[PDB]
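Supplementary material to the annual report.
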Amino acid sequence: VSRYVPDMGDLIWVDFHRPAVVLSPFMYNNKTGMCLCVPCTTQSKGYPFEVVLSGQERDGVALADQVKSIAWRARGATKKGTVAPEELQLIKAKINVLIGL
Amino acid sequence: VSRYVPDMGDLIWVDFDPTKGSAQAGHRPAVVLSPFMYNNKTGMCLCVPCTTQSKGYPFEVVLSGQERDGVALADQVKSIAWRARGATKKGTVAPEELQLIKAKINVLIGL
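Predicted assembly:
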């Protein structure tokens, strides 16, 4: 048996309430046992860094400014789903504006 | 008195414990990525942690000082409530260092 390894764009749950969208690629994720992801939530505040996620349900706002490196392997990540490509690009475009990357 | 507000490129201590010294035994400093108006308004910043000892890991960016050299772990970018956690300024990174860090984050994402 092999544990789920998060891939770019994946929507995941981890231990340690809310889901997260994975920014970093499978290769990095699998190598490090870490990934860069942004948390999702229920409440939308019209905050400029929110990205609307079209799966509705529980966490349909991605908080693109809250990029976090997390230990997904140690925290038991599981896959909830995957964001649309356009949702992932929006998340990156908001980060891009933040970091200046 | 008003608090130190991290600015982009600052190297900061997070959760500064004045008992652990300037050594801050057990902690790591961080290079602040996000710009000042963002840090100031939100109480948050994106930063990447630093350590003194290079592990030869691919996303390490060398940080060159006078006395000691260190590394920024560019892949570890982290959003931090600096206002809640009491950031202090340890220094600032060369514009070239910031660029290298951003360039590395850009590959990982990639933006």
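Chain B has one domain: 1-111.
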